[model samples]
Target chain A: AAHVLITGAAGQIGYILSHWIASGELYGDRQVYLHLLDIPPAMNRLTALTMELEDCAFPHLAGFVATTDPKAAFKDIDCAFLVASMPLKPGQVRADLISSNSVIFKNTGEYLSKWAKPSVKVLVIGNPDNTNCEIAMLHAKNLKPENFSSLSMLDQNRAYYEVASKLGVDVKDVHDIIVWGNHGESMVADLTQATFTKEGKTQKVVDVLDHDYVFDTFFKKIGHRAWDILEHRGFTSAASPTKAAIQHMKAWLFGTAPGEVLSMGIPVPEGNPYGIKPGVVFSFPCNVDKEGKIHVVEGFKVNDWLREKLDFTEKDLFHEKEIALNHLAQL
Target chain B: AAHVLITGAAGQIGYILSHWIASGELYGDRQVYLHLLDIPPAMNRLTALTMELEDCAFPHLAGFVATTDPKAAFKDIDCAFLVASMPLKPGQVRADLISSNSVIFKNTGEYLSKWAKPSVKVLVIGNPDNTNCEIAMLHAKNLKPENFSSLSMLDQNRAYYEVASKLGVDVKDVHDIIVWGNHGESMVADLTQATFTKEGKTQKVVDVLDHDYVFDTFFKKIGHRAWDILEHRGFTSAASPTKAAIQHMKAWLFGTAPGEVLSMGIPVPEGNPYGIKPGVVFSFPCNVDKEGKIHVVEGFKVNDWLREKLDFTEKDLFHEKEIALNHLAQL
Candidate 1:
């Protein structure tokens, strides 16, 4: 049986993540083990989560382990989600995001490269996903670059906003969304002739950026939906994004529909896949099959406006990666 | 939208019940409206449950409504599980168990009769379940008798013990158990002739009766485990029994696996099945099909020693029911 490790298992993502194994809803009927890792202070919370799993009575809940050390938990991991990041101090800047997250991801990737199963699929869901993935890739010196991926599900979440709100349907009905670019404000969501069929009716492939009201009102507003919820509810908005991230990782490891495309932040590793620089982990449209390998979903006709937006976001992310590399160049 | 109304919403069974709906682990991604009902004091607890549901980001979690009043919450109930009962206070006799529990069940059944959907299937999980179910049937005059069911999962659970303990496999691996008679000390768990192939063996049956253990250790020990947990833990055993109750109800509504018999407590209505007596709700060896209609698997062949034991337990239960009814008459 395969064992999956989850770090920061007492955080918001950790609470929801443990349920995936407990419910047997995601793991299928096949047996698998789970190792939950958290800070020493979080042991009580992790214990409670384990209790909830036992209460759930999932048949495949083979076993569970809780620990404070990464090496103790990460050994033999078949798949993992690294999602802990440094807390934002008062007046923290974007430049600090690189160093703050690098400390965590670098160690995680280093441990996994040495101890995890050869075919482990590592997904980074912490903020600044592209840079974090890059750091992990650098630490995993001998491992395949394709094994690392990160969060762009948040962008696909935004793509589901305007059209789904207009159609008055479940967001699940909206698929084939491509959230390509950075993970934040500079992130680009191009629907330029992007395929979207709402309630079985395929809307015409018009320019998604044509109407300033729709684009400006939605892009500016929907992207900040996370901040809005945080400001009001007094907590981060990862539950929804975490669900999407979970869906992305599960679909990657277990495969998805034949033509289905999922948004992911991964290496646009040199050799110009649409002219993005090598060694930079930027958001792109990708898919996975039964073999659990991510394939870049290409062959889209990018209109001029969409191309510029994608280029700008990619360049911004690439610059961040370069700046991060300069600091962690020893690896 | 599919609406599921759960009673005892803040209690053990209801807590797990609501989580299942939030995750859409069951009911196949239906847009579900959840209605929770409990006493006025439990309103705060219901809010906590709802808050946790929202945090799980269940896509199909349409909305939640909770109330202290049954009519407000239960009128549109499509599926309901009744999980409330009275405690056996110190020095309280057989009369106390029935009348106190009857008042609660009577009110619930009356509400269901007037408000629940015609096809609503209810499972009663509280102690003295058979009498409680009978009271419900009488109060819910407008609803079919089959709409309400008493807890027989205990008997099946008892049947689970000997097989699981002997085989050294998990309880889930033990299948096709046949338990008959009452839900209490009088309950009959027959693994003897009950056949299930296990670990490469075909046509395996439990070793015929350990008579002294069956009378002393087996029945009473397994039967009173809940009260024992309360004696030690200051509360009834919930975590496991709650899961078992949920599994029982799910199977009741969803049907049993092929070649398997479920322990079902159906009102005999006197001499109809099992010949224990009329108007007795007893656990019988039964099979349920896809539509959830139960087929009593009768004449399974009980030996003389087992027959005497069943008869003695039946009389004890009958005496208790009369004591309860007599108290109700005075009331």
Candidate 2:
């Protein structure tokens, strides 16, 4: 049995994610002991959720534990989905958002270091995910930085849909779409290396789709997709992100398919390609092996235009990391 | 590919249910075309939900349709999950609740009869489910009564959990737990035929657990489970019932395991051993074959106390059917 911890268990994403995990989507055919974490005020909702989970009677759900204590929640967990964070208040700037969430993850990371296993996999989905994930990774001194990553799969998924819809193909037929640098508007959605497989024949997406449309139209659309959903839906998306988180974790635990590349917000590895700086968690095209090792896909030629986009996102990530570190220093 | 129609697509249960069905939980590995139907005002929410579903990028989700028109939504659907109904307003009696929802189902039934495939399987999850289901079944003159069922698997699941919790066994190890008659306060949660399997050894639940506790405590808890969750969560339970709907439809489409008796709210067959009336859709222990045929389990001996309980639920169903039929006549 695997022990999985989900923070913000009372929130929308957690609510949806919990169901998928409990139903054996995350870890197929394996029994799971769920440790659901939320604040004290949210415990009532958690209690109600536990009742619902009990009612589900999922065969793979071996046990359940609900708690407000981070230490207890983090205890001996194999996988942790760090979804809880402070919401962006009106008039709050990016720095303020980073400052507000940094403390939460700092404490969570510290407790995780103290209590959780050294090899626990962590995926952060809250806002300013890259910086928040970095803060947690730095605080959890006992765990390797590779243990932590933030969510960029949502943006990658959005990019995939845009291409699939334009080409009139099933989204599954689209492969290797990448969102680089950060999980924000400045993120770079690159299709330079994407491929579309149809009836077993594969072609580069750049060959089939107009290069100008791919770079100009599809790229901008993927960047604005979240805001578009928020404007129309009157709330930030929950279901989509939950699904993305599931995919992100599943890919991390189980290897990606042969020749498949997916986007993840991971720490810039030592001596990486693309001249990306170390010490910041950034989104990159990555491939995972069966042993749960993530390797940043290297050796792709970067065009000048794509390089400029990558630099913009990298700068944005660096700025957020600076704000987060400065705030941590004051504390 | 299967075309599935889910009404109330903007609501909570519909929102959660859509993801599971789209992800291939209901129909393993089969592609699905989802037709999401809600009221006019809910179209915006439905549009947002569609965006989320597209964002999921499920390989099995081949097509999508969103509409308020029942005729269009019902067209050529192989399965319909009728989850939309009027809520019980303050001071509304059972008759008032049944009366308000009757017309909705009546129109839906007519549309199903006119537009949907004759083989379409309908599962109703809205309030007064048994009566509302009967109304739809009665109005769909072209379709057989067996084609429609109301939801009782929620109550059955609750019964399973209660037994499993009391026995200190995994819920999956408990089998054949049945919730008889209406899906309401009058429903009967019977453990007489339930079995607990551990280490390849099976024992009757009644023989292991004290009969007094099973009847006096476990039975009432299952009946009041929904209300308890509602009072605590500040809303009606959605996730549990959604899972129940999924299980019910899956069992109906795929066959139940051999000797596995689950619960379904189907029209009482002509020669039912319980002697329930034929016109009302009532919950009974049922076994579905590989061909998607449902057979009510028979030959169980009913004690005096159990017979009295069954009579109470049967009377309630008869009264609800009368109210629904009377309301339909006025139109």
Candidate 3:
């Protein structure tokens, strides 16, 4: 049985994510013992979630532990989804939001380091995720920086769908689409290397699509997709992010498809092809092996347009990293 | 690709259920095109749900249509999940709630009968589901009564867990647990024939557990499980019912395991051994075959205790049926 920890277990994403994980979406045939963590005030909702899970009677759900204590929640877990964080409230500055959320990541990181399995794979999903992930990794001195990554899968999915819809092909046929850097507006949708397979023929997305439309419209659309969903739906997205989190974790645990490159917000590796700095988590084209190891894909040509967008996102991630670090220094 | 219709696609249950169905939980590997229907007021949420589904990029999701028009939503659908109904508000009479929801189902039934495929399978999950299901079947004159069912799988799951917990066994190891009659307080959990397999031995649940505890505590607990969840969770359950709805539709389409009796609330067939009236949709021990046919498992001895409980639930269903029919006649 695999022990999996999901923070923010009482939140909307947690509510659906728990079911998906328990139903064997993430672990694939392995019996999973879930450790659900939330704040004390949301304990009732967590209890409700537990009751609902019991009612589902999922055969692969070996057991569950629900608690508000991070220590209890993190204890010996093989995987952790760091989903809980303070939201950007009304009139709150972006830097202030990063600082406020830093405290949460700090506590969770320390607890994960102290109690979780040494090889635990952690994925952070909360806002300013790259910075939060960096902060968590910094605090967890015992764990390698590679153990932590933030959500970029949602952004990658959005990019894939944009190209798929444009080309009138199944999204599954789209490959190598990358969302580089911060999981925010500055995130770059790199189309230069993207390809779509149709009728046994593969063609580069940029080779077929209008270059101006791809850069001016498609890039902006994918970057702002989350905000578009929030504006129209009147809530921050839950389902899409839930799916992305599952896919991210699944790809990390199981290897990605042969020769398929996916995007992940990982700590820049020691000898990365891209000249990305080491202090912050950055979204990059990545691949995972059968042994659950991450390898950032190297030597892709960085066009001027892609380079400019990557730099913009990297700068934004660095700013957030500084804000979170300064807040941690005060503690 | 199979076209599946889900009414109440913006509600909490609908939100989760859509993902499950699209991900091929109900239909296996068959590609599904979803038709989502909700009231005009919930259009934004529907839009949000569509956006999320697009983000999932599920290979099995062939296409989708979101609308407030039942006529448009029901068109050519092979499977329909009737999940929308007026919830019981504070100080509202139960009969009034049933009457109010009847209008929604009546319209849906007419639309489904007119626009959906003749072989479409419908499962009702809305409030007063047994009565509502009967009402829908009554209005859908073009389709057979067996085409429809109300949700009772949740009740059965709860009952199974109770027995499994008592025996310290996995819930999957428990079988033949029947939830008879109304999906409400009057529903009966038949433990007389319930059995659990442990260590390669199948033993009657009643023989292993104390009869006094089964009748006195277990029955009451299972009967009031939903209410207990509502009171503790501060919201009506979303996940459990979502899973139940999926399982019910899956069983109806694909068939149950060999000799494994599951529970479903279907209109009483002509030759059912149990004396359940033909006018009402009642929960019965059922087995389905690969041809998508529902069979009411007959010849189980209904003991005196089971008889009394069945009579109680039958009477309640009859009353609700009368209320719904009376409301429908006024139209």
Q: Give the distance in Å from residue B161's predicted Cα in candidate 3 to where it truly belongs.
A: 1.6
Tell me what TM-score chain B of candidate 3 gets against the true chain B.
0.96
Clashing pairs in 1: A270-A278, B270-B278, B270-B279
DockQ of 1: 0.10
- Show the lowest summed lDDT stretch of 10 residues, model 1 chain B: B229-238
The candidate scoring highest on DockQ is: 3
Best by TM-score: 3
For candidate 2, write residues A39-128 as lDDT tens digits: 888888889888889988888899889999877799999999998866766444334578677888888789889889888999999888
TM-score of 3: 0.97
- lDDT, model 3, position A175: 82
What lDDT would candidate 1 get against the real structure?
0.68
- Cα-based TM-score, every candidate: 0.68, 0.97, 0.97
Kindly report which residue stretches of model 3 are placed more than 4 angstroms away from their true locations once superposed: A90-96, B91-96
Q: How far does residue A109 in candidate 1 sit from its true spot (Å)?
A: 1.6
True contacts kept of each: 0.06, 0.68, 0.82
Candidate 1 lDDT tens digits, B122-172: 777766777777777777877876787777765566556545555656556
List chain A TM-scores, every candidate, in order: 0.89, 0.95, 0.96
Q: Rate the local accuracy (lDDT) of all candidates.
A: 0.68, 0.87, 0.86
- Give Cα distance to truth, residue B27, candidate 2, Å: 1.3
Given the true complex, what DockQ would model 3 score?
A: 0.79
* Model 1 residue A213 CA deviation in Å: 5.8
